[PDB]
Amino acid sequence: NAMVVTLDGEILQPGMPLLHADDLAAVRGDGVFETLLVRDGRACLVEAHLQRLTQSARLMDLPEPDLPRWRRAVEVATQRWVASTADEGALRLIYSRGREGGSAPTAYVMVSPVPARVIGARRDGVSAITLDRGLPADGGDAMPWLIASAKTLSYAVNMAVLRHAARQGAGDVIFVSTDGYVLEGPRSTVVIATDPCLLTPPPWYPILRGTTQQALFEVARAKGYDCDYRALRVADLFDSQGIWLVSSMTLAARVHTLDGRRLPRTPIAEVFAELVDAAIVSDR
Amino acid sequence: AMVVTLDGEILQPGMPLLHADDLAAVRGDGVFETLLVRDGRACLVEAHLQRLTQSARLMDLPEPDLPRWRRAVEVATQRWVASTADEGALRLIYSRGREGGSAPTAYVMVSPVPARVIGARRDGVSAITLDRGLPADGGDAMPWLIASAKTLSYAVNMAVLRHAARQGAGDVIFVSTDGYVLEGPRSTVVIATDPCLLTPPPWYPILRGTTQQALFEVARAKGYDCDYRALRVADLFDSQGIWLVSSMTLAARVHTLDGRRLPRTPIAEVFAELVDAAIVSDR
Numbered sequence: 001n002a003m004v005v006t007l008d009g010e011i012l013q014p015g016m017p018l019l020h021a022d023d024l025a026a027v028r029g030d031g032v033f034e035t036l037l038v039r040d041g042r043a044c045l046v047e048a049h050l051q052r053l054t055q056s057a058r059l060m061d062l063p064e065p066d067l068p069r070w071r072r073a074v075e076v077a078t079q080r081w082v083a084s085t086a087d088e089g090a091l092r093l094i095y096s097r098g099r100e101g102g103s104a105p106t107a108y109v110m111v112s113p114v115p116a117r118v119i120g121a122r123r124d125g126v127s128a129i130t131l132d133r134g135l136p137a138d139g140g141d142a143m144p145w146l147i148a149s150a151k152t153l154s155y156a157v158n159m160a161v162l163r164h165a166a167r168q169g170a171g172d173v174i175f176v177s178t179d180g181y182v183l184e185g186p187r188s189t190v191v192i193a194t195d196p197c198l199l200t201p202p203p204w205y206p207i208l209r210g211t212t213q214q215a216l217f218e219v220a221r222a223k224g225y226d227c228d229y230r231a232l233r234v235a236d237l238f239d240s241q242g243i244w245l246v247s248s249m250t251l252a253a254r255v256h257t258l259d260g261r262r263l264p265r266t267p268i269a270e271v272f273a274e275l276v277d278a279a280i281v282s283d284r
Numbered sequence: 285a286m287v288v289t290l291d292g293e294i295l296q297p298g299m300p301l302l303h304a305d306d307l308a309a310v311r312g313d314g315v316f317e318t319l320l321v322r323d324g325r326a327c328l329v330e331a332h333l334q335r336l337t338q339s340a341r342l343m344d345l346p347e348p349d350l351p352r353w354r355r356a357v358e359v360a361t362q363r364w365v366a367s368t369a370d371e372g373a374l375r376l377i378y379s380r381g382r383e384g385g386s387a388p389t390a391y392v393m394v395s396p397v398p399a400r401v402i403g404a405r406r407d408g409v410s411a412i413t414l415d416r417g418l419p420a421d422g423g424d425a426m427p428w429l430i431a432s433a434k435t436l437s438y439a440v441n442m443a444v445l446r447h448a449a450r451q452g453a454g455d456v457i458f459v460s461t462d463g464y465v466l467e468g469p470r471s472t473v474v475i476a477t478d479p480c481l482l483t484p485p486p487w488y489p490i491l492r493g494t495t496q497q498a499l500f501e502v503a504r505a506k507g508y509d510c511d512y513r514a515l516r517v518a519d520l521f522d523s524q525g526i527w528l529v530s531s532m533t534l535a536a537r538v539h540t541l542d543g544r545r546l547p548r549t550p551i552a553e554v555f556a557e558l559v560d561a562a563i564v565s566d567r
């Protein structure tokens with residue numbers, strides 16, 4: 001089922017507990033993490049995930065992550081998963097503040113099966129609803145204490161928002177600020193397609209920076225696509241050629257229905273998935 | 285630290301309890317409660333198990349088995365009471381369980397009361413107001429944000445406290461973007477206006493304070509009028525006193541707010557006594 005690789009590089013026995021009852025990841029969600037996709041024998045975009053992991057650790061007053069130590073744990077876990085199966089894997093880096101009163105932070109690497117919801121979201125897409133996030137667009141930089149750009153282990157609200165939309169037949173959520181500007185998804189980055197130009201909310205918004213979105217901008221710009229960071233509104237969502245919820249594991253899930261209103265399908269939608277396919281391998 | 289799971293086992297300390305895929309650790313996905321052990325028993329057990337039931341309901345968690353929770357609490361309490369007469373910090377950890385699994389994670393943990401608690405009770409704290417990022421109407425207009433649930437996802441709460449620590453402040457008072465007083469990152473805000481006690485209303489995106497409510501009950505019987513009002517920052521500086529009330533710290537008087545020192549009022553002498561009798565009013 002689940003596989004664990006500590007920073008020393010040894011693979012822990014399945015079915016055995018790793019974390020103590022007083023680890024700050026469990027009692028207070030006090031830590032940062034990253035999620036990587038294993039595809040065709042290798043984890044995708046390792047450096048971009050370790051770069052953001054280094055930034056999330058700085059925003060959380062966590063010890064600076066040892067990148068050579070993290071690269072070995074991911075490489076050991078990667079080769080163990082690829083040897084075990086040819087299916088894609090969900091590789092996650094867990095970096096917590098450690099036990100209460102202790103000094104050493106908790107850090108390990110975990111590979112798990114990719115959920116079945118991913119193959120449906122890639123192939124079929126998702127129905128999404130816009131939901132008030134409660135944050136204004138100024139929240140990321142003007143209010144740094146909210147650390148909205150840090151990918152922390154405190155994801156209880158993100159999961160509850162998804163369950164709220166599930167009870168209403170929605171497969172995902174697009175967060176909208178009190179100002180009326182598009183922010184992000186609870187687990188993905190919002191990218192739209194306008195005439196052909198791809199847009200995404202600007203990074204000074206209280207949102208996470210998408211590793212997949214930036215790599216998508218690199219491959220798309222090198223192929224002739226114009227990309228930019230703009231203040232998107234809900235109206236701009238409905239007039240686009242396509243909306244996608246982009247992330248590291250789900251890759252690209254087009255929003256075919258937004259707030260119950262179906263959105264038309266464009267020829268750019270078949271190339272968009274290929275654009276995200278080349279993005280996660282642009283490191284190779 | 286001592287751990288007593290709802291299964292009934294007392295774990296040998298220094299041994300791991302949770303697997304690497306527990307949703308408490310990978311997603312902060314769970315609810316918890318913090319209780320104070322004083323004079324041989326945890327304080328306001330029933331009121332904390334009631335809020336645990338409400339936080340679990342907002343989180344689509346299985347309804348907690350209160351008789352099993354009471355056993356883990358009683359077993360963990362007497363193990364601490366047997367070891368020392370000092371106060372203890374008892375916490376109920378209730379998570380969704382392992383990723384992909386079905387059984388939820390549930391255990392009770394007792395630890396020493398931190399040294400910051402003795403100072404906050406005795407001396408008080410210097411606090412700063414900080415924007416919470418939520419509007420005051422956000423609790424009712426956005427129920428999906430489950431701001432009334434006491435979850436294990438306290439990364440923002442702890443980061444906010446560290447930010448104020450770098451500025452010489454001992455705690456924080458959250459203010460909404462609309463400018464209304466909400467709560468602390470780890471406490472409930474109670475102020476003193478003319479002998480009247482006020483606190484922000486619970487339909488705000490805040491937690492309902494078990495200690496604050498038990499305080500309102502004892503205070504009303506002693507002649508004080510208590511009520512829930514929409515407080516602004518001006519009400520903080522014009523008040524007779526500000527306290528950050530909670531289950532473990534009890535009452536932490538704010539002696540300095542945003543750098544401005546606040547005078548001491550005769551109500552400051554009585555307030556600590558009111559919270560002491562509040563947390564044992566169940567007995």
Ligand SMILES: Cc1ncc(COP(=O)(O)O)c(CN)c1O
Nearest residue numbers: 187188189208210211212247248
């Ligand atoms: C809040 C949030 N925003 C955006 C993203 C997308 O980031 P990435 O492309 O690196 O997966 C994620 C990752 N699930 C996320 O949790």
Ligand SMILES: Cc1ncc(COP(=O)(O)O)c(CN)c1O
Nearest residue numbers: 469470471491493494495530531
């Ligand atoms: C966010 C928050 N609000 C309020 C409180 C106070 O609640 P209670 O008096 O029931 O402990 C706490 C306790 N730390 C808290 O963490």
Ligand SMILES: O=C(O)CCC(=O)C(=O)O
Nearest residue numbers: 035187188247248249250
């Ligand atoms: O599993 C979840 O709900 C979120 C994980 C994620 O980021 C994803 O869907 O790829």
Ligand SMILES: O=C(O)CCC(=O)C(=O)O
Nearest residue numbers: 318470530531532533534
């Ligand atoms: O989050 C908690 O409840 C623990 C902190 C607390 O209650 C306190 O400091 O009094």
